[PDB]
Design an enzyme around this catalytic site. Structure first.
Site, short mmCIF file in Angstrom:
data_model
loop_
_atom_site.label_atom_id
_atom_site.label_comp_id
_atom_site.label_asym_id
_atom_site.label_seq_id
_atom_site.Cartn_x
_atom_site.Cartn_y
_atom_site.Cartn_z
N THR A 1 -8.03 6.89 -3.06
CA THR A 1 -9.35 6.39 -3.43
C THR A 1 -10.35 7.53 -3.34
O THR A 1 -11.37 7.53 -4.02
CB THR A 1 -9.83 5.24 -2.51
OG1 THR A 1 -9.37 5.46 -1.17
CG2 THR A 1 -9.31 3.91 -3.01
N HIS B 1 0.77 -1.25 0.00
CA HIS B 1 0.00 0.00 0.00
C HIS B 1 0.80 1.30 0.00
O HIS B 1 0.23 2.38 -0.17
CB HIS B 1 -0.94 0.03 1.21
CG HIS B 1 -2.10 -0.90 1.09
ND1 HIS B 1 -3.26 -0.57 0.43
CD2 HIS B 1 -2.27 -2.18 1.52
CE1 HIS B 1 -4.09 -1.59 0.46
NE2 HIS B 1 -3.51 -2.58 1.11
N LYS C 1 -8.84 14.11 3.72
CA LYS C 1 -8.06 12.87 3.83
C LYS C 1 -7.22 13.02 5.10
O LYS C 1 -7.18 14.10 5.70
CB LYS C 1 -7.14 12.71 2.61
CG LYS C 1 -6.03 13.77 2.50
CD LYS C 1 -6.21 14.64 1.26
CE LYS C 1 -5.57 14.02 0.02
NZ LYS C 1 -6.52 13.30 -0.85
N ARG C 2 -6.54 11.96 5.53
CA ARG C 2 -5.74 12.08 6.75
C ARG C 2 -4.69 13.18 6.57
O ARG C 2 -4.29 13.48 5.45
CB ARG C 2 -5.05 10.76 7.09
CG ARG C 2 -6.02 9.71 7.63
CD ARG C 2 -6.59 10.11 8.99
NE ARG C 2 -5.55 10.12 10.02
CZ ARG C 2 -5.30 9.11 10.85
NH1 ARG C 2 -6.02 8.00 10.80
NH2 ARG C 2 -4.34 9.21 11.75
N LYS D 1 -13.72 8.86 -5.55
CA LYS D 1 -15.05 9.21 -5.04
C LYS D 1 -15.51 10.55 -5.60
O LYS D 1 -16.67 10.71 -5.99
CB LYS D 1 -15.03 9.26 -3.51
CG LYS D 1 -14.83 7.90 -2.82
CD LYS D 1 -14.39 8.10 -1.37
CE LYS D 1 -13.53 6.95 -0.87
NZ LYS D 1 -13.28 7.35 0.49
N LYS E 1 0.79 14.45 1.76
CA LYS E 1 -0.46 14.82 1.08
C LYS E 1 -0.45 16.32 0.77
O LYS E 1 -1.27 16.80 -0.01
CB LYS E 1 -1.68 14.48 1.94
CG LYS E 1 -1.60 13.13 2.60
CD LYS E 1 -2.57 12.17 1.98
CE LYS E 1 -3.09 11.16 2.99
NZ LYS E 1 -3.75 10.02 2.30
C1 LIG Z 1 -12.01 7.44 0.89
C2 LIG Z 1 -11.58 7.79 2.37
C3 LIG Z 1 -10.23 7.93 2.72
C4 LIG Z 1 -9.04 7.74 1.69
O1 LIG Z 1 -8.81 9.02 1.06
P1 LIG Z 1 -7.51 9.41 0.17
O2 LIG Z 1 -7.77 10.81 -0.26
O3 LIG Z 1 -7.26 8.35 -0.85
O4 LIG Z 1 -6.31 9.45 1.24
C5 LIG Z 1 -9.92 8.31 4.00
N1 LIG Z 1 -10.88 8.52 4.92
C6 LIG Z 1 -12.18 8.38 4.62
C7 LIG Z 1 -13.19 8.77 5.69
C8 LIG Z 1 -12.56 8.01 3.34
O5 LIG Z 1 -13.90 7.79 3.04
#
Ligand SMILES: *Cc1c(COP(=O)(O)O)cnc(C)c1O
Ligand SMILES: Cc1c(NC(=O)NC(=O)c2ccc(Cl)cc2Cl)cccc1OCCCCC(=O)O
Ligand SMILES: Cc1c(NC(=O)NC(=O)c2ccc(Cl)cc2Cl)cccc1OCCCCC(=O)O
Ligand SMILES: *Cc1c(COP(=O)(O)O)cnc(C)c1O
Lengths: 816, 816
Positions: free
Chosen positions: B655, B356, B547-548, B659, B553
């Site tokens: 991911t 990952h 995101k985190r 979305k 990032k």
């Molecule tokens: C989809 C999702 C993530 C992953 O997000 P990235 O932008 O790929 O780091 C993290 N947290 C939640 C709550 C998500 O739904």
């Protein structure tokens, strides 16, 4: 089948589909993979479904009518299993028995799967449970309040003859009877300090723990009443138990939540013994603080607290919940801003206290430094209560300086302590003993000074047991033959048992009574080999002593007799003696060395006696493992002789004695606790009484107890002591029992030797009577027919009328 | 109403009585005292009732047909709420909506009461959740295996602009979806030592912890398939955790049970970061050990393990469950007595590993002394595996001594460590990256040596998201207008979205697509004031990065642009600029100082920007509190611009980007992770790409990255750094952000300055396009219509065929 209800066509059909509904939807199982445990749950959910309708209307009813509420505070509720009891009080037993039969299952097999709710140690906890059942049956708006321990009384295992304790994870597979109510969660405070401001004191900087309630239904006997037992669980708040920032570790902070939640983790396994551990004090305040908030919230709905005592009654089961007194004052004065005197008047009028014992080591004396740290404000209030109370004494007995220090709630000495019992008497409008003799001893001895100050406070309320679980449930065969002759009304009106007196000469009844006892003994003898394995003779006399292990209960005195019986047989092998199977069972508190030594002695005696070929089947000594409520329901109906041999003046009342009397056992015991009222009720000729009376014990104490004297004048006793000393019962470890012998000879607080002679002599008389089946049975009938006074329905009716100020009612609530 | 199913007459009626059945019997409540929480539970129980029938037949089906089973091991399963998702996959949404409406309740209000099952940190955990949904929808006999943490990802609170963590007690009020299965409880061992006997090694004197499984249903999309997610709970045995006698305290022994049970207490809140704590290692072995036993037991039913790989496939989600390899060997060799080589063949054939990330600090390197103490036998096995593997390398590359030490599973140095990633590659028959670029980097860089040894092992499987939760569930308005034109088949066949390409010039569609986005923004703008309070302008461009929080990032790069926008407005106040509401949300690991400093920076910028009167409503900076799955379902459908600006080569795949693409947002990002395949799918002209490519980053590293150069040549950048340094954003604490400035200037691992110029320039272009509604929307349509490749159904079909050896099937299971 018996009178366990009707097996209606429509209801057996309905029951079956609901059993299947739950097996499918609730257990998500299908008949091909369902385990007996799944079957038990489908049944429990189906039975529980039948009382929710009534539970809701009963509670809604109390809101509408708004009667005076009774709050029974206890840190113990020895409930046992609840499936069968619910079926009994709802008259569902036969229907359920039939329905499961058609589904091809054995209801009795499924019942054995339920875990005991062992949230009690012994008598005190079981009384609370019997009381809850009676208050429901008598239609009282009563609530049982306690702690929901995730670990109840430990499970007892015998290894190499020694007791091994193991965690009682009774919630492991879930509890279908309880229901969490996360809407009434409440905060409880600890530690902190007191700030004295302009308009009152303030309890500040406290650590908060949340109290989550769980409700369990308590159904009355066939009256459509279902009361509630509310048990509190400790939960840590998610903030401060994480939010008190500035390094430490996030993971650690979360793991450390199991520190505030440890409060409701385990029940203290002490029976009639006080251990001043902080965790114990925390549990006591925890249940008190949460309960009171809930009680006042309910009242605020129903702000002049003048009417509080008219709508609220809180009964203290021993001094365990005593903090309710200073806590009620705290709330009224600090939060509600009532003047001290008005607050005190209210407090005294709503609180009542029940004493359960007179032994000093059982008395709660909490070190002041502990209360000082954990509950600073309560200590201040207790000092203030003491101050005003002693002023009352001084005014009443001018110059009696010694009486002042004797009555103080604060004890001076090594470390200062708070006498919780004195606290309860001062802040309660009623103090009661649990048996006539115990109640008199309180007035003459222990609480004499208090009695002289306010005689009106002291009462008596002889304990009782519920005839539902203790007769109909555990002895349906006996309940049935009784009903065949006098009807079913006695189940909620035990006094009617007297009517059986007119069948004492009935040839058919005598035969029946003797038959159910024989069937009960065959069933127990079977269960013994089934689950524990090693045969017993069902034709012998079943001599049983089951209760917690204590020096005051004198299981040791029982042992001396057993050894005597063995020694006599070895002396004259070919002489006839009435065969006996003596069964002794009970748990010892883990830290009670002497009590654990006694269990080893019992198993050690059995090792010798049970394998002696000359003895044959004339004498077996068996130790009943893991004695608990569910086990009691099995042995008691099968017993012939009930042992209640505590030293006169030590057993406040006892309740096991009553269970045995109701189930066809004859009693051999001393004039102690309720034994006195039972013999009085049945007639001394129908009881096997022996040994010293309270007075004799006192006379002996004046002159001084010397066990050597008895050892010197009784050859049979001497022989036994020399057998223990020489390793006759412990070959590999000859000095194994030196502690027991030492104690018996030099520090026997309960004078076991003093009652030895009269005890074995009396035991001879019971063996003589047993040889005459017809007469034994007729005496049994005299005991059973005369046990009605000992139903907790009588006890509760007395509490209700003489303490709570409420009228019991046997009126059926308007259907479900 | 939409296509959330049919509101049949019979089913709405049936639903209502069942809602009332549960409200009465299950919640024991009556309409007069039912709380919204009670209503939510009655509904959840009613909906859960609809899938148990299918759950049972699906499982029974797999037993009968006995297909190859897929086991997905992950220490994380970011599930979120489950009520709505279940209604969607069962086509119950409208019926339920109607029924609750008639009962006078707002279904949406009730849905908000459910607690998120936050058993994950971010991407890795959510992928596992999307995968479970896809495996059910594709009719695969798959099981999700993990740990049932009682505390999931902490709840984030912002105090004075700082993040405050607080315990996520998600089970507080109970979980209606799970079901304990105390029949499959298993023992897991720890510590102990290894005894080498005559016929094999023995793992002895171990401490035992029990693993209790809890099953949660995973329903496929409208195919009547319901798979199972089994989560393990740690339980202490009642014996030794009490029975290891000889003083200590009985109470203490019971309290100390919360030591073995701490294993499943809390989820480690680290996202892409390794912490070698013993508790973490214990959780990893715990889930592995219990899962494998359960897997073999199932197989033994279905002893030649030659067929094992034909019936079993276990997928490792990262190296967290890597102990599955040496544990499978342990069982096969030690317990089953298979020869090493046969055992290894089986192990490699059933295991597959998914990488990952490539950042070193995220790599699992467990100190040998830790494995030595906790799992002695596994260490021996790992040494043996390493021994035989290195022998393979030496044979393949004779004399390449440096390659040997580079590939070893054992790392020498300060303290010896075990490279878990090397362990996984050696014992797996397939290793895959999560995006084409990441997969190539693995072969060229990180695992080059391994790739040269066994090229056949390395594959790629681009991540995906489930169109059910990520479109139909969170954006019904968009799902509906799409369905109006191309039907419903695309929900389980996302590729059909391309058909929308032919409506790119459709005047009605363009208007519709723009309308649902506007409705989504109005709803979110409302929710913002409702639950968080402080207004935003719904007519502005919604610029969101959720995101985190991570340095890689580059939320910091986002901040620089925000400050730039502000500075430009202050320079020319009366100049027109496209209004923007930039929203940044995400949690920082509690020990990640820099990440927590960045959150304070964001709120600090908002404090200045949001209250500057000259700025007006042209620019708002909002920090989205407690970003989680349920919150994602709200912001994503409302976003216009999706920020995916990680430094090229650091975000393995991502991911969230997918979305946003599926929900009508345009993307501004770097050629990183899946961004490359999305732009490739939509056409670069329809994407806002900028900054360095992987190659450019490498070129910069060769010559050396000097942030001063950028600070020197860009006046706008210099101005911002001097604002941070002088306390412009922290008046009371002028040097508050020195750590950030210091880092940016001297130790920026992710070269934020290097991409600054191209980033703000590119942001200018998105603002230019936004000014042209019609064209913006048409580009949106190009993105949506071209997102089909990113459905996890495509990902899973590829795993199934290229790794597991199973054929997906969209066949409806024979009704419920
Ligand atoms: C989809 C999702 C993530 C992953 O997000 P990235 O932008 O790929 O780091 C993290 N947290 C939640 C709550 C998500 O739904
Ligand atoms: C698995 C299964 C069932 N299963 C079921 O009802 N229930 C479950 O499995 C079940 C149980 C609990 C929970 Cl939370 C969830 C499920 Cl899905 C019923 C009939 C047949 C069946 O297959 C055959 C098993 C072996 C039978 C034998 O060996 O005799
Ligand atoms: C108490 C009660 C009910 N109560 C019920 O259904 N259920 C319970 O009380 C209840 C809830 C949970 C559990 Cl485990 C056990 C019970 Cl017994 C229903 C109708 C009326 C009612 O009285 C009036 C209350 C006040 C109403 C108001 O102020 O508007
Ligand atoms: C009735 C009962 C007791 C109390 O017995 P006594 O002989 O009065 O001490 C204790 N334990 C259990 C299990 C009981 O049912």
């Amino acid at each position: 089948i018996s009178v366990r209800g009707l097996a209606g066509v429509e209801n057996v059909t309905e029951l079956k589909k609901n059993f299947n509904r739950h097996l499918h939807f609730t257990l998500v199982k299908d008949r091909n993979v369902a385990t007996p445990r799944d079957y038990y749950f489908a049944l429990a959910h189906t039975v529980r479904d039948h009382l929710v309708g009534r539970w809701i209307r009963t509670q809604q009813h109390y809101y509408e009518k708004d009667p005076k509420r009774i709050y029974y505070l206890s840190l113990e509720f020895y409930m046992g299993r609840t499936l069968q009891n619910t079926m009994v009080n709802l008259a569902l037993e036969n229907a359920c028995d039939e329905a499961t039969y058609q589904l091809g299952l054995d209801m009795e097999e499924l019942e054995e799967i339920e875990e005991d709710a062992g949230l009690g140690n012994g008598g005190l906890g079981r009384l609370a449970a019997c009381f809850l059942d009676s208050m429901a049956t008598l239609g009282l708006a009563a609530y049982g309040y306690g702690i929901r321990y995730e670990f109840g009384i430990f499970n007892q295992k015998i290894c190499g003859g020694w007791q091994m304790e193991e965690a009682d994870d009774w919630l492991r597979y879930g509890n279908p009877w309880e229901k969490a109510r996360p809407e009434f969660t409440l905060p409880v405070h600890f530690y902190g300090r007191v700030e004295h401001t302009s308009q009152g004191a303030k309890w500040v900087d406290t650590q908060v723990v949340l109290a989550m309630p769980y409700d369990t239904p308590v159904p009355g006997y066939r009256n459509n009443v279902v009361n509630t037992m509310r048990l509190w669980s400790a939960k840590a708040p998610n903030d401060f138990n994480l939010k008190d920032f500035n390094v430490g570790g996030y993971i650690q902070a979360v793991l450390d939540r199991n520190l505030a939640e440890n409060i409701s983790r385990v029940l203290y396994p002490n029976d009639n013994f006080f251990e001043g551990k902080e965790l114990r004090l925390k549990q006591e305040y925890f249940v008190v603080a949460a309960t009171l908030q809930d009680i006042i919230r309910r009242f605020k709905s129903s702000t002049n607290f003048d009417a509080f005592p008219d709508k609220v009654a809180i009964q203290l089961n021993d001094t365990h919940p005593s903090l309710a007194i200073p806590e009620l004052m705290r709330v009224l004065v600090d939060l509600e801003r009532l003047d001290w005197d008005k607050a005190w008047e209210v407090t005294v009028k709503t609180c009542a206290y029940t004493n359960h014992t007179v032994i000093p080591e059982a008395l709660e004396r909490w070190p002041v430094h502990l209360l000082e740290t954990l509950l600073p404000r309560h200590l201040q209030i207790i000092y203030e209560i003491n101050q005003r109370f002693l002023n009352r004494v001084a005014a009443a007995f001018p110059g009696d300086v010694d009486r002042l220090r004797r009555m103080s709630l604060v004890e001076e000495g090594a470390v200062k302590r708070i006498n919780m019992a004195h606290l309860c008497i001062a802040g309660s409008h009623a103090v009661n003993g649990v048996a006539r003799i115990h109640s008199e001893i309180l007035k003459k001895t222990i609480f004499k000074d208090f009695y002289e100050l306010e005689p009106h406070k002291f009462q008596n309320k002889t304990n009782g047991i519920t005839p539902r679980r203790w007769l109909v449930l555990c002895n349906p065969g006996l309940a049935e033959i009784i009903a065949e002759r006098i009807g079913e009304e006695y189940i909620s009106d035990l006094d009617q048992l007297r009517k059986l007196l007119s069948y004492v000469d009935d040839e058919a009844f005598i035969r029946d009574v003797a038959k159910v006892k024989q069937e009960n003994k065959l069933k127990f003898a079977a269960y013994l080999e089934r689950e524990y394995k090693v045969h017993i003779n069902p034709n012998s006399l079943f001599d049983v002593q089951v209760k917690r292990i204590h020096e005051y209960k004198r299981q040791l005195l029982n042992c001396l007799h057993v050894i005597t019986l063995y020694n006599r047989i070895k002396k004259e092998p070919n002489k006839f003696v009435v065969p006996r199977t003596v069964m002794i069972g009970g748990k010892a508190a883990p830290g009670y060395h002497m009590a654990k030594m006694i269990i080893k002695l019992i198993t050690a005696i059995g090792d010798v006696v049970n394998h002696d070929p000359v003895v044959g089947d004339r004498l077996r000594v068996i130790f009943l493992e893991n004695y608990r409520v569910s086990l009691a329901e099995k042995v008691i109906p099968a017993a012939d002789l009930s042992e209640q041999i505590s030293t006169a003046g030590t057993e406040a009342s006892g309740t096991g004695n009553m269970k045995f009397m109701l189930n066809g056992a004859l009693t051999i015991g001393t004039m102690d606790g309720a034994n006195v009222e039972m013999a009085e009720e049945a007639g001394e000729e129908n009881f096997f009484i022996f040994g010293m009376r309270v007075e004799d014990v006192d006379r002996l104490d004046q002159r001084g107890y010397n066990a050597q004297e008895y050892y010197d004048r009784i050859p049979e006793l001497r022989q036994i002591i020399e057998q223990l000393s020489s390793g006759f019962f412990s070959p590999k470890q000859p000095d194994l029992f030196k502690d027991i012998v030492n104690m018996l000879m030099h520090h026997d607080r309960f004078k076991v030797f003093a009652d030895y002679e009269e005890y074995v002599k009396c035991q001879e008389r019971v063996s003589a009577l047993y040889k005459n089946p017809r007469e034994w049975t007729r005496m049994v009938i005299r005991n059973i027919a005369t046990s009605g006074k000992f139903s907790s329905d009588r006890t509760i009716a007395q509490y209700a009328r003489e303490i709570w100020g409420v009228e019991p009612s046997r009126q059926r609530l308007p259907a479900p």
